[PDB]
Amino acid sequence: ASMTARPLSELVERGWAAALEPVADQVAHMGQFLRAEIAAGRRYLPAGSNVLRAFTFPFDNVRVLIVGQDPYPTPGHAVGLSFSVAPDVRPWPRSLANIFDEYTADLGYPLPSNGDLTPWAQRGVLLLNRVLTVRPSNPASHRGKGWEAVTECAIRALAARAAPLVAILWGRDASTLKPMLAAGNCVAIESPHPSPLSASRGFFGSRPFSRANELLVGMGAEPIDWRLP
Ligand SMILES: O=c1cc[nH]c(=O)[nH]1
Ligand SMILES: [Cl-]
Numbered sequence: 017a018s019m020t021a022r023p024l025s026e027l028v029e030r031g032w033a034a035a036l037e038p039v040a041d042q043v044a045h046m047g048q049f050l051r052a053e054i055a056a057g058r059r060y061l062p063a064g065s066n067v068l069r070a071f072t073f074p075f076d077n078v079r080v081l082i083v084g085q086d087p088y089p090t091p092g093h094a095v096g097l098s099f100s101v102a103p104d105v106r107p108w109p110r111s112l113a114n115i116f117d118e119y120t121a122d123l124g125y126p127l128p129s130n131g132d133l134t135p136w137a138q139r140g141v142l143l144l145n146r147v148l149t150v151r152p153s154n155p156a157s158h159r160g161k162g163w164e165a166v167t168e169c170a171i172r173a174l175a176a177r178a179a180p181l182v183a184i185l186w187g188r189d190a191s192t193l194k195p196m197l198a199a200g201n202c203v204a205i206e207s208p209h210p211s212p213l214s215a216s217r218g219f220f221g222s223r224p225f226s227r228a229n230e231l232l233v234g235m236g237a238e239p240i241d242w243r244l245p
Contacts (some may be wrong), residue, residue, distance in 0.1 A: 017065040020047030028068055032074030035173035042165050043068075049161055050149065060149045060158070061087050062094035063165055067148050069171070070137070079140040080228050080240055081183040083167075083190035085209060086147040089155050097143040099210075100133035103104070114210040114219065119242065120176030128244040139240055144170065146189040159189070171196045180235035183229045186210060188202040203231045 017027065024033040024040055036043065050060050050067075062069075085166030087094035088109055099112055108116070108131045121128055137143055146167050151157040172192045174181055181202045185191045197204045207216050207222040208214040229239035 018047060019043050019064075019067065020051055021066040028071035029074050032071040032170075035075050036071070036166070039166050039169040040057060045243060046149075046162050046166065053151070059152050061089065061091060062149070062228060066094070066096030067146055068097070070142055071143050073137050073140075073142065074097075075086055075174070076177075076179075078142045079133055079180070079182065079232060079237060081142045081171070081181065082136075082186070083171075083183065083193060084145045084186050085189045086145050086150045086158065088154050089150050089215045093150050094150070096148075097133055097137055098145045100143060102149035103132040110212050111210040111215075114212070114215045118210070118220060118222065119225060119244075120147075121221070123142055123242055125243055126176055129244075130199075133244070135244055136240070136242070140176070141180045144194070163192050164192075168193065168196060175199050175202045177213070180232065180237045182231045183233075184224045184228060187214065203235070205231075 019027065024036050024043060027033070028036065033195070037132055053060055082098060084098045093105065093109055095102060099115060101109065101112065104228045112131050116128055119125065133143060144167060147158050147163040148166065149158045151162065175197055179201065183193070183197050183202065183204040185193060185204055185206040191206045194204050195207060203225050207224065208217040208219045210219045232239050
């Protein structure tokens with residue numbers, strides 16, 4: 017699963033491998049960056065085999081994109097799908113608790129049983145971050161190190177598809193993708209990030225899930241079934 021050693025066709029789903037062809041060298045460079053970090057004595061999250069995990073769900077099937085900032089900084093939380101945690105993790109990360117608070121407020125569903133968001137990924141929600149790795153315990157430590165070109169390419173490719181797309185952009189770094197979503201087949205929702213530092217500035221009450229579904233059906237697409245166990 018090494019980004020430095022193997023090509024996109026062997027790392028990600030077929031549609032994604034084609035979509036990310038323009039950043040093939042950049043992805044290899046990121047693998048070399050992570051190698052250099054480890055040689056220097058610094059770690060990264062998520063685990064190497066999970067870094068590109070969002071791109072293992074089919075490119076063609078994406079209907080909604082959620083974009084955050086960067087992975088969870090606590091070892092054992094980040095799994096390569098933004099905001100998700102393994103089903104045995106608890107307490108939940110604070111931003112996930114905030115996401116779930118808004119989920120219940122918006123949709124009226126019960127609080128989820130755990131923090132595993134794979135059902136969303138399986139239903140065509142792409143769970144991206146603007147930056148795909150972080151040093152443990154150091155939020156935003158890999159900002160500006162080369163991932164932004166990769167996630168820009170992902171968005172640009174999604175937007176070029178002959179398909180509707182609704183994007184939910186959480187926070188400042190995610191919102192730098194908005195210009196790439198300007199085409200008529202794409203709509204973006206942006207809000208403050210669900211982190212405690214920002215959530216009270218406009219994440220709570222933002223109702224992104226029902227808004228995304230209104231947007232999807234307005235484009236002639238089926239809505240996301242957001243319901244989690
Ligand atoms: O994946 C994650 C987790 C925390 N914060 C983010 O922006 N994304
Ligand atoms: Cl932010």
